[PDB]
Design an enzyme around this catalytic site. Structure first.
Site, mmCIF file in Angstrom:
data_model
loop_
_atom_site.group_PDB
_atom_site.id
_atom_site.type_symbol
_atom_site.label_atom_id
_atom_site.label_comp_id
_atom_site.label_asym_id
_atom_site.label_seq_id
_atom_site.Cartn_x
_atom_site.Cartn_y
_atom_site.Cartn_z
ATOM 1 N N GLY A 204 3.115 7.189 0.797
ATOM 2 C CA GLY A 204 2.848 6.219 1.686
ATOM 3 C C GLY A 204 1.525 6.221 2.607
ATOM 4 N N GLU B 133 4.095 3.849 -0.576
ATOM 5 C CA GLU B 133 4.982 3.945 -1.591
ATOM 6 C C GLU B 133 6.053 4.965 -1.168
ATOM 7 O OE1 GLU B 133 3.030 5.271 -4.966
ATOM 8 O OE2 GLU B 133 2.396 3.498 -5.566
ATOM 9 N N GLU C 141 3.735 0.407 9.282
ATOM 10 C CA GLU C 141 2.492 0.216 9.154
ATOM 11 C C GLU C 141 1.669 1.122 9.831
ATOM 12 O OE1 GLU C 141 1.242 -3.154 7.484
ATOM 13 O OE2 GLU C 141 3.366 -4.146 7.667
ATOM 14 N N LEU D 250 0.927 -1.475 0.125
ATOM 15 C CA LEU D 250 -0.050 0.104 -0.100
ATOM 16 C C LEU D 250 0.976 1.094 0.054
ATOM 17 C CD1 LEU D 250 -2.873 1.442 0.515
ATOM 18 C CD2 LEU D 250 -2.597 1.133 2.791
ATOM 19 N N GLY E 104 22.551 -4.101 32.196
ATOM 20 C CA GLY E 104 23.952 -3.419 32.156
ATOM 21 C C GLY E 104 24.713 -3.734 30.824
ATOM 22 N N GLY E 105 26.303 -3.792 31.307
ATOM 23 C CA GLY E 105 26.824 -4.077 29.872
ATOM 24 C C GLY E 105 26.415 -5.421 29.239
ATOM 25 N N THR F 153 6.947 -5.911 4.083
ATOM 26 C CA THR F 153 7.703 -7.069 4.802
ATOM 27 C C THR F 153 7.237 -8.322 4.359
ATOM 28 O OG1 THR F 153 6.720 -5.316 6.660
ATOM 29 C CG2 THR F 153 8.128 -7.269 7.363
ATOM 30 N N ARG G 128 21.185 -12.125 38.703
ATOM 31 C CA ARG G 128 22.419 -11.263 39.178
ATOM 32 C C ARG G 128 22.369 -10.544 40.310
ATOM 33 N NH1 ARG G 128 27.058 -9.896 38.858
ATOM 34 N NH2 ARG G 128 27.718 -10.774 36.756
#
Lengths: 379, 379, 370, 376
Positions: free
Chosen positions: D132, D128, D360, D126, D336-337, D159, D264
């Site tokens: 769009g 473009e 969408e 649909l 965290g990291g 998609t 953790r």
């Protein structure tokens, strides 16, 4: 009053054009491949922008703290991984500046100021990341020398920095904060190894590697600061490096806002440039406004960092926490603003969002910054 | 850099001390029966803090725009209503400064600088508040004098200020924004009446009244600036007092965070001080961080309001919008932190919340501010 | 499915007319003079919405919790002070419903359901407000009776309620939270008085006064379920009245947005986006309250969590929306001439009473890390 | 016992069904799906084996015919472990809605069994390059060549393209528009280069390019010139699937977050004994659950096709998407990291979340639809 010297602005135009010229295209590629932004390193070094924080005595540029963040900002605006170069160099050399012996300063800081080597800074450990006071890496004496053993993790520019200001426990049974000291480990040094470069969300370029110490023996002259003083050094090093991270966040967001404004002026949905929809205008207003508050605050805290003010703990943390929050908040909006295009790697906002996230995570997750701010408020 | 000068810091310490004891205790009463801060105006005038921006030349303290903001901040911190004394004073006198003829300026500014007379500033109109070029208030030139007719609304400190820089069209067909000029109306001028004072959510003290002009004869020297150039003058004044309302917002918020911090350390739930719960600690951290950013940007914009910088409009809008928005979030959290207590007027934070709301609203609603910003961004 | 039964919506049109027509015009005054919503109370009573939760068993409306929330919402949509009447009635009767022996239920619920008497609920204490498990209002048994000495605070609707399920610690020893029991004290009951009504930011109409107990001799038949269970019962009732405070917040927000939308029709896309955020947040808050309200009536396992979750979000949303509502109406929005000023002040409290959204987040956290 | 405001017990059985299908069959592959930017084929295989490739397809045509909550719940419980994998039922409903909502019984018959069986996947053209969001101003033309049609133009942002089988692309007939099932094999019908996306890297987002694609006249879906009344309906009904996608991604992120923070320990206490992390998880869970519940209200509203389905649809997608972002961001923050590294999924769920806000109908477009549904 409440402005950078116009000097700072000449500096900014300099580092800005260096960033626009030698960093940007390399930023997109750096991120994709998750390889070091070397072109950035030789372009910063070529413009004597690789570590402007270093004092004049060692051949540095002698940058003000506000000037130092300006550089880190103007780089992150185009490449967050490269932006780490002067930022990690300030971070890794700060313990060496703030507390290093004259002999150790004269040894190391001139090679940085010249561009021979970058610094990394090993404080965090996996079983004590934010609890830096209770770490495991170990410096025992051995003759004149020092044996390190242990773990450092999330060490930026690992594999590429030649010099590693490590913080290792020296007297495992003393009063907490007085049993840790800093030692400049080289890549040379036997038993010092690096972990796999992490697969990062952002800063994909600048390597975040674990670094392992397997009986790394090192001379006594590489003690930086006295013995036990490593945490009192690390604290002032955070105090000063928080603001660099704030400036990096401000920068990441600035680049994002720049692509946002450009894209909204070019593209036209529903017949008109999306720039003129009052919704998008509000979005850009919040982006620009937040960004500018975060900018001013990291800059205030940088003023707090070169003047070494009292409340630098708070504002530094705050400037880092807010700037990083802002970066996420803005760069996400920037991605949102470019719609479908924004989640494409062809445009930088995607990378900039992925990049800004660490500003909220690394060098102490902003929850720690909030802990710090709270402890400072209750005084 | 990013320092209020030691001059300003002393000035801050001064006005803070005046707010604490001379203004603050009355703050609850001013807000309650919605009365003008008589104690506050008295104390400010006796201390030269009632309208400190006024030129030296006309006997003012010659306060820096930043200093002016600092005063509005420190006053607002304890009583928002009282801060409008210097704020609405700067607002109403600024068109008389920025464009005022040497004579009329020397006529009115002494009255202000000593503290005899107060100013208010009539630009907005009930019908088209933000489309000021299309104001209905006309001044028809009659002899040397003019005859005013029209409708200024929302005009803070009316009924209580004596001289009113009102902005009227002096050409129902002249050109857009060049058809308007500025006239100092007296509280004495015939046909000039006030509307019933609005029943306001917060700032209840400072009167918000309609301005009615029923064939108001005003002398010819009441023109400030050229005829027609009043709009340019009004827009410039807007750019500059935006930042003082920003400072006020920061101040209201600062009061909230102060009283909250106090209440939080001392009061206890579950038997340890609630400031021990890391959740309250995060909340207080965010309050402080938001607030400090709002402050630093209020100050940056104040610097730009002295230097008459280009982006003065943008940074002022940003400072007002951010300071006010931030203030809203913070004073709301301030009520939250005091729980059942904070919901009562026994504690001021609730009032400070009502007060932060108007800073999101008057002086150009933050939506209008976001538009102004988005417009400077889309240059 | 995932929608009010058509009779819930039939209930909505009813209370909407009752609110728009009988409650709304007086709401502005209710707030202005900080006095009880008398017009609202007598009109909700006239329309059977002053306490529709009561089982028909006692002459109540037999309303499901979803219905109760919808009523509280349509009232809060026009008057929060007024919206507390059914809400505080369900609150004060909830311990009396959930665990009282049919004796005390039959003594109290018909007089509430009919509208002779309003209930308030004494749990919150100034000293041990958030730590209700460690409260200090003492009640020791004196023969068949109990004697009360102590201080409930921030008791909403306290000045006007007749009957008060106050909860007092009976045995200091043992596990606090298992040593607490609830007894309904009357307004005429000897020695029990109120503090001065709090001067509140919003909801000024519904009076919140302290409750002081100076050796009040309370009969043994004032027992509300077995001695000692009172904390079990109190967190049990909170589990349910959380959801009504959410519904109140949804209503307050609704009213704010309603005046907002109306004003936006009267006088560009930015304000549209702001309204979209307002409405969208609001509706998530509404559906979240209703999911939880249905979750209460079936007394679902996680009512602890969802009641908190809806109580917090609705209230949070109410606060932004009412704030945003004030914002959209500009200067007019900062005036009491328009109600959005009152509605913002009203919505703030929804974040505070019946467990500050801090406590709500903690109980939420708690269920998350079980 | 009254089942008001709760998903029905059969929906819940479906839930532990699709959850186990995801955990046991989809989850391990999600990391690889994102890393390589490849279609989740293993996921598609297990979804097809389990009636989840498009369970919305009617039972008349061999689907399970699941109601909007049921289909949505699948999309969620899948997205919970892999967003790309969740696009399978989501993009299939997306591509199947014009064919259902207005398609003739013949055109429904030509195609919906191939979906419901699991043979073919659908995608939906649909939007473009130029228009769009302004569906009234597109430029992909359908010319009546005999009874048949010639197509030219370019749909973008599609998609599952290049990998999906049938493409209900929508073209203007007289400059207005009608819907047509273009096949993959149809002459001259090609795809553009696939996007290198921030997230949903598995599910391919490609251009759709037409150089004189001839398609028979029975490829017409609905009314000639009046696909537009079908296109706004497809949006009305499919926002909620993208929302549920958001809720699923978000829920997954909250799941890994909770797992990490309970597992953790930090400063010597578990990192979730810190009230900062606790409030953070609480905000996450409640936003999350609110967005989830509104997704469910809007799904039911897309089942019985209510009047306000536009608003409730848009809002549920706009809120769930926004909330997902908000949560996954904190999820990345929480680990965290470790959360920053791709070794843990919280990072991928964040990138996956950033799109639920965009495609969408970017939540800005969602807010426009809401604002217009408000002033009714």
């Amino acid at each position: 009053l409440y402005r950078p010297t116009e000097e700072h602005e000449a500096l900014r135009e300099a580092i800005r054009s260096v960033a626009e010229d030698k960093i940007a295209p390399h930023a997109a590629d750096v991120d994709e491949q998750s390889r070091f932004p070397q072109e950035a390193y030789e372009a910063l070094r070529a413009s004597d922008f690789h570590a402007p924080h270093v004092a004049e005595e060692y051949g540095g540029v002698g940058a003000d703290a506000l000037a130092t963040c300006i550089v880190i900002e103007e780089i992150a605006r185009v490449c967050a991984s490269s932006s780490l170069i002067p930022a990690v160099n300030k971070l890794g050399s700060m313990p060496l500046i703030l507390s290093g012996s004259d002999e150790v300063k004269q040894r190391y800081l001139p090679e940085l100021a010249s561009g021979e080597a970058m610094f990394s800074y090993g404080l965090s450990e996996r079983e004590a990341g934010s609890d830096t006071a209770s770490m495991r890496t170990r410096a025992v004496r051995d003759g004149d020398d020092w044996i390190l053993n242990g773990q450092k993790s999330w060490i930026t520019n690992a594999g590429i920095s030649k010099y590693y200001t490590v913080m290792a426990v020296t007297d495992p049974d003393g009063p907490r904060g007085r049993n840790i000291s800093a030692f400049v480990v080289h890549i040379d040094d036997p038993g010092f190894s690096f972990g796999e470069p992490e697969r990062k969300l952002g800063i994909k370029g600048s390597p975040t590697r674990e670094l392992i110490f397997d009986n790394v023996r090192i001379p006594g002259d590489r003690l930086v600061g006295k013995v036990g003083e490593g945490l009192r050094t690390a604290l002032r090093t955070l105090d000063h490096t928080r603001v660099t991270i704030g400036a990096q966040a401000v920068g990441i967001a600035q680049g994002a806002l720049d692509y946002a404004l450009g894209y909204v002026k070019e593209r036209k949905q529903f017949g008109k440039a999306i720039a003129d929809f009052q919704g998008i205008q509000f979005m850009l207003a919040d982006m620009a406004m937040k960004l500018e508050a975060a900018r001013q605050m990291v800059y205030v805290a940088a003023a707090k960092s070169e003047r070494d003010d009292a409340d630098l703990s708070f504002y530094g943390a705050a400037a880092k926490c807010f700037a990083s929050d802002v970066a996420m908040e803005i760069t996400t909006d920037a991605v949102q603003l470019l719609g479908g295009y924004g989640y494409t790697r062809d445009y930088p906002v995607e990378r900039m969002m992925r990049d800004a996230k660490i500003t909220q995570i690394y060098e102490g997750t902003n929850q720690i910054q909030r802990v710090v701010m709270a402890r400072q408020l209750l005084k």
